[PDB]
């Protein structure tokens, strides 16, 4: 039994853009979730529908780890029942979410002195995402009555915006890395267990 590759998710060199959030399937391993919940370096650690101190007792078919970067002020949107540009247009948790939301300030990794333009989020969308939906499209968004038909213009917008993270930003405008753990139980051998 390998120990689960949590370092792979949490210590990855670069994170996904929130609009193109990464998902990793975890399987066939032992998870000491204590490595996460006993860490003092996470600024957000919130579990819905389950206590993280009970996870070491349990077995799952698979564990999913979604990861991305957003700004500090937006971490609040990564929870059931939220609204705003992130929850509505980028990463949506369902109302009946069971899992953990873990975040930490990543200014030292992700901000860059001239601005990191490489982290993006969707600013405009026709409708809200469904829970766990991912939209990587890049069609021009019609904000007014006249159609754009593929052409950028006034009230005809490119749908994404760049964060521009700089180390001198206020903390709410600094980058945070986020991992969301969800749990899948199926009719199969449980491939992910704690020490039980």
């Amino acid at each position: 039994t390998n120990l689960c590759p949590f370092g792979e998710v949490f210590n990855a060199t670069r994170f996904a853009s929130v609009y193109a959030w990464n998902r990793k399937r975890i399987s066939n391993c032992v998870a000491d979730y204590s490595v996460l919940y006993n860490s003092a370096s996470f600024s957000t650690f919130k579990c819905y529908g389950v206590s993280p101190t009970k996870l070491n007792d349990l077995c799952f078919t698979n564990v999913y780890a979604d990861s991305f970067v957003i700004r500090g002020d937006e971490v609040r949107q990564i929870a059931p029942g939220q609204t705003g540009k992130i929850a509505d247009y980028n990463y949506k948790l369902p109302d009946d979410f069971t899992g953990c939301v873990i975040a930490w300030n990543s200014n030292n990794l992700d901000s860059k002195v001239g601005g990191n333009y490489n982290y993006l989020y969707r600013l405009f969308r026709k409708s809200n995402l469904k829970p766990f939906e991912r939209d990587i499209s890049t069609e021009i968004y019609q904000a007014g009555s006249t159609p754009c038909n593929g052409v950028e213009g006034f009230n005809c917008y490119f749908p994404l915006q760049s964060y521009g993270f700089q180390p001198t930003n206020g903390v709410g405008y600094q980058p945070y890395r986020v991992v969301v753990l969800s749990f899948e139980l199926l009719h199969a051998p449980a491939t992910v267990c704690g020490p039980k």
Epitope: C47, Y48, S51
Partner: antibody
Framework: QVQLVQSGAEVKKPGASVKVSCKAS????????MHWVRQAPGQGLEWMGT????????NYAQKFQGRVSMTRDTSTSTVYMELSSLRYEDTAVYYC?????????????????????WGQGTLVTVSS | QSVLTQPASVSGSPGQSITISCTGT?????????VSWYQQHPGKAPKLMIY???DRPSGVSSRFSGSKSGNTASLTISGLQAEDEADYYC??????????FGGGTKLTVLG
């Protein structure tokens, strides 16, 4: 978008009862607890109690125990507050409020939510 | 589990900082960190400003902050603006497993 739509204003004689509805839409009704908060005209907010629609559990302020009944109909995503043996001092705007989901912290301790959405209020006047 | 005590009124001038206190007991404000603050404008439902003593929900300006010491929680509004004129209510969990509001504070923006 989350909407909580309450029943219309009511007038009741002392000793009567009132049943106020709160119809939820735009979210999974059974995932969030609902609370009832009331406010007499020109006075403060007063918490009355809560119902958890997923298990039908309720918890009421001692003051209303034995006289309030909160119920839920999952088939219509509606919460109800029935307040019996009304008196003048029950004259108030009654609001339903959704409690945002609570969570467990790192150490396994439970943290409640907070009121994230509100109904429009229902004025109930108790008068002879 | 008895209405928490708040000053009836506070007033400040635009740009100033004001603080609203909320004094309960060891059974509520002093017993837990589950203190919220709600803002209420005339004719409107209350609106969450602060939860868990000091956290803001999304959309609430950082001009709003909260703290607590012993049996007393405090809401502070910095950079006071005309639109902050409203009633403010503290709200706490209690050892009875119930929730209780403070009596409320009317905030006047002077000048």
């Amino acid at each position: 978008q989350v909407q909580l739509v309450q029943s219309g204003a009511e007038v009741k004689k002392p000793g009567a009862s009132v049943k106020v509805s709160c119809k939820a839409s735009g979210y999974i009704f059974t995932s969030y607890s609902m609370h009832w908060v009331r406010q007499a005209p020109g006075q403060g907010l007063e918490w009355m109690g809560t119902i958890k629609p997923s298990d039908d559990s309720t918890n009421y302020a001692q003051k209303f125990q034995g006289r309030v009944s909160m119920t839920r109909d999952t088939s219509t995503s509606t919460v109800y507050m029935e307040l019996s043996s009304l008196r003048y001092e029950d004259t108030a705007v009654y609001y339903c409020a959704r409690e945002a989901r609570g969570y467990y912290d790192r150490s396994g301790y439970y943290h409640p939510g907070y009121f994230d959405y509100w109904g429009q209020g229902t004025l109930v006047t108790v008068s002879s | 589990q008895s209405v928490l005590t708040q000053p009836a009124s506070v007033s400040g001038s635009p740009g100033q900082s004001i603080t609203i206190s909320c004094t309960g007991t060891s059974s509520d404000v002093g017993g837990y960190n589950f203190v919220s603050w709600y803002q209420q404008h005339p004719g409107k439902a209350p609106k969450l400003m602060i939860y868990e003593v000091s956290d803001r929900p999304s959309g609430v300006s950082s001009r709003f902050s909260g703290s607590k010491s012993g049996n007393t929680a405090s809401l502070t509004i910095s950079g006071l603006q005309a639109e902050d004129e409203a009633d403010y209510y503290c709200f706490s969990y209690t050892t009875s497993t119930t929730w209780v509001f403070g009596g409320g504070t009317k905030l006047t923006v002077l000048g």
